[PDB]
Structure formats: C-alpha cells, structure tokens
Amino acid sequence: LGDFFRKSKEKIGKEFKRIVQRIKDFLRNLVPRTE
Amino acid sequence: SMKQLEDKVEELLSKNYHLENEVARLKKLVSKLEKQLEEAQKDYSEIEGKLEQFWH
Amino acid sequence: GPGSMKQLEDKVEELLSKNYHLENEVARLKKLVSKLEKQLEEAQKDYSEIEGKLEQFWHDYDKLEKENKE
Known part of the structure; x- marks a missing residue:
C-alpha cells in the first residue's frame, strides 16, 4: 500500500499521545488541589 | 558482410542470454x-x- | 548471396528487437529495485x-x- 508507513507513523504518534494525555488527565483529576 | 552479420548474431545471442539472466535476478530481488x-x-x-x- | 544474407539480416533484426526490449526491462527493474x-x-x-x-x-x-x- 502506498503511504502505509507514513500513515501508520502518524497513527502510532496520535494513538500513543492519546494514551499519554488520558493518563495525564486521569492523574491530574486525582489531585484537585495540587500546585 | 556475411562475417560481420554472423559475428553480430553470436554477439546478440550472448548479450540476450545474460540479459535474460539479469531480468531473472532483478525479479527475484524485487x-x-x-x-x-x-x-x-x-x-x-x-x-x-x-x-x-x-x-x- | 542475397538469400543467405537475408536470413542473417532478419536474424540480426529479430535479435536486436529482443535485445532492445530486454534492455528496457533491465532498466525498468533496476529503477523499481x-x-x-x-x-x-x-x-x-x-x-x-x-x-x-x-x-x-x-x-x-x-x-x-x-x-x-518508596
């Protein structure tokens, strides 16, 4: 498939960052009064 | 000449033989x-x- | 004479046409490689x-x- 590796590199970057950000949102929600 | 055309037949037969084997090698590499x-x-x-x- | 020379000229032309196509195929396969x-x-x-x-x-x-x- 043409541009499979380009599309998949984009998909891998978007999905991993989505996992990192949702862990970040979850942890931030555990500490409502952090500074 | 007759000798010139006989030599080119043998020359082309040999070149086409190696070109066929090169096509076979290139298709296997592909x-x-x-x-x-x-x-x-x-x-x-x-x-x-x-x-x-x-x-x- | 002309008869035997025609058989050789035809064979050269036939081998030349195949040679040309084979050279095009080699150049095409190398670019693809x-x-x-x-x-x-x-x-x-x-x-x-x-x-x-x-x-x-x-x-x-x-x-x-x-x-x-810890």
Whole structure:
C-alpha cells in the first residue's frame, strides 16, 4: 500500500499521545488541589 | 558482410542470454524486497495493535 | 548471396528487437529495485525513531515508578 508507513507513523504518534494525555488527565483529576 | 552479420548474431545471442539472466535476478530481488516490505508492515501494525490493546 | 544474407539480416533484426526490449526491462527493474530499497530504508529509519521515542518514555516512566515506590 502506498503511504502505509507514513500513515501508520502518524497513527502510532496520535494513538500513543492519546494514551499519554488520558493518563495525564486521569492523574491530574486525582489531585484537585495540587500546585 | 556475411562475417560481420554472423559475428553480430553470436554477439546478440550472448548479450540476450545474460540479459535474460539479469531480468531473472532483478525479479527475484524485487520479490525479496516486497516480502521485506510486507514484514516491515506487520511490525508497524504490531505497534498499532499494542496501542489499541491498552483501552481493553 | 542475397538469400543467405537475408536470413542473417532478419536474424540480426529479430535479435536486436529482443535485445532492445530486454534492455528496457533491465532498466525498468533496476529503477523499481532502487525504489523499493529506498522505501524499505525509510520504513526502517522511521521505525527506529518510533522505537527510540517509546523506549525513552518507558525509561522515564520506569525511574518514576521506582522513585514513587518508596
């Protein structure tokens, strides 16, 4: 498939960052009064 | 000349013989590279599958 | 004479036409080989860049878990 590796590199970057950000949102929600 | 045309027949027969064997080598290399690109594809999709397996 | 010379001239023309097509096929297959080699090189280069980024994240998270264990 043409541009499979380009599309998949984009998909891998978007999905991993989505996992990192949702862990970040979850942890931030555990500490409502952090500074 | 007759000798000139006989020599070019033998010359072309020899060149075409090696060109046919070169085409055979190049098509086998293309086939080898297509399989290597197919394996690289599975390695990419394997990372996608691992990232999907986080949500469930 | 002209008869035997015609058989040779025909054979040269036939072998020349096949020679030309074979040379076009060799030049076409070499371009495709170099195209596939560059695609494989770029796919392997981007894969290692993806790999290193994921390794660095795991490494940083590993030290985080160890420091937050005690």
